[PDB]
Structures are given as C-alpha cells and as structure tokens.
Amino acid sequence: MAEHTGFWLDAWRGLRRRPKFVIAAALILLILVVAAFPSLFTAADPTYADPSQSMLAPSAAHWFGTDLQGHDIYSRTVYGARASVTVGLGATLAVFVVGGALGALAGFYGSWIDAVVSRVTDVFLGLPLLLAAIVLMQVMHHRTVWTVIAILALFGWPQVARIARGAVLEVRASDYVLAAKALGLNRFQILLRHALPNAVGPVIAVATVALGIFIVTEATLSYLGVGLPTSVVSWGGDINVAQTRLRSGSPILFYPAGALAITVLAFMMMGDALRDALDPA
C-alpha cells in the first residue's frame, strides 16, 4: 500500500457504513483506553501479593480470584494491556513495513538486489532467536519494551519478506505494468503506484497473525531474563506462569488468554475490513 490517492474520501465514505469496520474500531478504541488509563478500571496495585490469599475463587473482593503468589488477577490483566499491546503492535508494524519493502524491492528488480536480499533472508531465517537474544542482550544495560520490539522485529521480518517477494513476482509481468512503462514512469514509480496496491493482501494476512505470535513469544524471552524486566505486568508472562496450575483443576490461565484472543480478533477484523476496501464488491 503506497499510493491509493484519487478518492480517499470515497473509500473513507464507503468504509464508514461497514458494520465490520465499526465494530472492530470500537473494540480497538476500548483496548487502547484500557492500555492508556488503567486506573479508571481498578484501584488495586498489580504488583502487590498478599500470600495469605494464595488461590481464592472469584468474589466481590477479587473479581477474577488470586494466583499462587496472591496477586489480584483482575488488576494484573488490566495492567498487562500496556506492555502486551505495545509489544505486539510495535513489532507487527515494524516487520510489516521493513519486510514488505525489502521483499517488494527484491521481487520487482531481480538482478542483484534480489540476490543480496534473498541470501540475507536465507541467513536470517535459519538462525535461532534465543541464541541471538542471549548474545545481544549482554550489552544492553537495561531491558525495555523497545529492546524486545527490536529483537522480535529483527528476527521476524524474513517470512514477511518472502511472502511479499512472491506476491510481487506474479504482478510484475502484467499488462498494466507495460502500460505504465509506456506512459513514462520509472521502475520505482511503477512499483509503488501500481504494483504495491495490487499485491498487498497476503502481507496483511501474515501480519494479522504475526501480531498474536509476537505477543506470545515475548514471554518466552522474558522467562529466561533476556527481555522485559520482571516488574512489568504482561499477558503471556501470566499465561506462562499459570499453565502449571492446570492439572489441579484451576482455570486461571484463561483470563489473560481471553484478553489476548479478543485483541487478536479485533485486529483481524480490522485488517480484513481494510483489505476489502481495495477490491470492493
């Protein structure tokens, strides 16, 4: 998606009265409000654990119960929204932009640009994530949200690059590409204006799935001490720690997982509503 000029005013009007778009936008707005102002929804401290209240059932005092340590689960699932949403959205946008640009450049030119980009992709694609995280985080004096985003994006862009390259390969032999060349455009203007809008669906799909994948992988990183300091509440850290209480019959894993699934659903609906505005019917 580079140049959809012309009538964004008609698209936006055609996108307004689209119930899927409206519902997805309302859900996204709610999620953002929860991630921005957590103190409207709860008064408790997410990092306070009274251990004489280890694993209680939901009541009027604790709406979701407590966990093995004694934390309030409602407070923790309200305050994990900031970290989880920030990491997921940041890494998704980063890999989308970077991998899409790289793969679309590779698939369109194809002489030596393709060679270098595809070899770098084959190297980055076979190198594990935990090894490189362990090696790189020995120089970062402080873990943050942005270091986690940087790691996740730097090792997640290749599979988006592959899909974008494959998508542009099919398009670059079309007849409107020759017509654009015969009008007088250069290869870069052709690329943007004609070949980005026409080959952008698959990338949207893989991005909408990579969002939830990233939100889950950040916990893998945090658990070993190479990401996101332990004083930070997050969805995924809670799932990781609470999955072990499941044999005893305690279903406290499904409270952060429910929020994660709702956010992923909202963004999938939004992505499809945006993708159905490039070939309306």
Partner 1 sequence: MGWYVARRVAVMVPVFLGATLLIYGMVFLLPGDPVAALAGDRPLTPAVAAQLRSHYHLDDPFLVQYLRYLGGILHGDLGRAYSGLPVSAVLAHAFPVTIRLALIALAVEAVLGIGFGVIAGLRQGGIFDSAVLVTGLVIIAIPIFVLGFLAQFLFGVQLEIAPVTVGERASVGRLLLPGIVLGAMSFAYVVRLTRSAVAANAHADYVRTATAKGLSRPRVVTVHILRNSLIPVVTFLGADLGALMGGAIVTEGIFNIHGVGGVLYQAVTRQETPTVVSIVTVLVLIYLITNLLVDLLYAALDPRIRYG
Partner 2 sequence: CGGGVLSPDVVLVNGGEPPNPLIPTGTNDSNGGRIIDRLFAGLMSYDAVGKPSLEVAQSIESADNVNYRITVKPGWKFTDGSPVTAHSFVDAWNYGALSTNAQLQQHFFSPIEGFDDVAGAPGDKSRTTMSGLRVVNDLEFTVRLKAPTIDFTLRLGHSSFYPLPDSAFRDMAAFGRNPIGNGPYKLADGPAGPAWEHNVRIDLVPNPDYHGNRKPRNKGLRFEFYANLDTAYADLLSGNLDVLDTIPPSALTVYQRDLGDHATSGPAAINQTLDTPLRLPHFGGEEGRLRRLALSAAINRPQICQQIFAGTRSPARDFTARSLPGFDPNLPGNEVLDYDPQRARRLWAQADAISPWSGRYAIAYNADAGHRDWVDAVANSIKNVLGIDAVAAPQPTFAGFRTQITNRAIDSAFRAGWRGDYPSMIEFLAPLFTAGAGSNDVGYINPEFDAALAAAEAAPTLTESHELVNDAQRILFHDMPVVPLWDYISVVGWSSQVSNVTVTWNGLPDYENIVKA
Partner 3 sequence: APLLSVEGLEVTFGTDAPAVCGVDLAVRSGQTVAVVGESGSGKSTTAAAILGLLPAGGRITAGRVVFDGRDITGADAKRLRSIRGREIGYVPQDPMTNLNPVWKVGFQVTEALRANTDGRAARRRAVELLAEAGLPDPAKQAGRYPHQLSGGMCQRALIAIGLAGRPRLLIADQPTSALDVTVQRQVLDHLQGLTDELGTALLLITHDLALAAQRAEAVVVVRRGVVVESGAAQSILQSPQHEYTRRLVAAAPSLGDILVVSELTKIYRESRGAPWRRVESRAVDGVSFRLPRASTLAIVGESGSGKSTLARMVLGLLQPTSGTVVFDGTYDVGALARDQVLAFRRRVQPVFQNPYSSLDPMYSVFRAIEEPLRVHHVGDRRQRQRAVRELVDQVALPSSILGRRPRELSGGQRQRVAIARALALRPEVLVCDQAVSALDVLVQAQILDLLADLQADLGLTYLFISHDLAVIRQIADDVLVMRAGRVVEHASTEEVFSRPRHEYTRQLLQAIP
- Residue ranges that bind partner 2, judged by CB under 8 A: 49-52, 54, 68-70, 134, 223-226, 230-231, 241, 244-248
Distances (CA, A) of 205 to 47, 269, 274: 36, 11, 11
- Residue 149 near residue 90, CB atoms below 8 Å: yes
The 183-222 contact track toward partner 3, x by CB under 8 A, reads xxx---x----x--xx------------------------
Cβ count near 85 (within 10 Å): 24
Contacts of 44 (CB under 8 A, 6+ apart): 72, 74, 75
**Any contact of residue 241 with partner 1 (CB under 8 A)?**
no
* Tokens 């004083």 belong to residue: 231
The 91-130 contact track toward partner 1, x by CB under 8 A, reads -------------------x----x--xx-xxx-xxxx-x
Residue range at the interface with partner 3 (CB under 8 A); choices 19-27, 59-67, 151-159, 176-184: 176-184
Q: How far apart are CA 76 and CA 64, in angstroms?
A: 10
Closer to partner 3 by Cβ: residue 7 or 48: 7
Which of these, 44, 46, 41, 38, lies nearest to 69 by C-alpha position? Answer: 46
Residue range at the interface with partner 3 (CB under 8 A); choices 6-14, 95-103, 111-119, 132-140: 6-14
Contacts of 156 (CB under 8 A, 6+ apart): 91, 95, 99, 210, 214
Closer to partner 1 by Cβ: residue 49 or 120: 120
Contacts of 24 (CB under 8 A, 6+ apart): 266, 267, 269, 270, 273
**Shortest spacing between CB 162 and partner 3, in angstroms:** 22
* Tokens 């609470």 belong to residue: 242
Residue ranges that bind partner 3, judged by CB under 8 A: 4-7, 10, 174-176, 178-185, 189, 194, 197-198, 278-279, 281
Residue ranges that bind partner 1, judged by CB under 8 A: 110, 115, 118-119, 121-123, 125-128, 130-132, 134-135, 138, 158-159, 162-163, 166-167, 169-170, 173, 201-202, 204-206, 208-209, 212-213, 216, 239-240, 243, 246, 253, 257-258, 260-261, 264-265, 268, 275, 279, 281
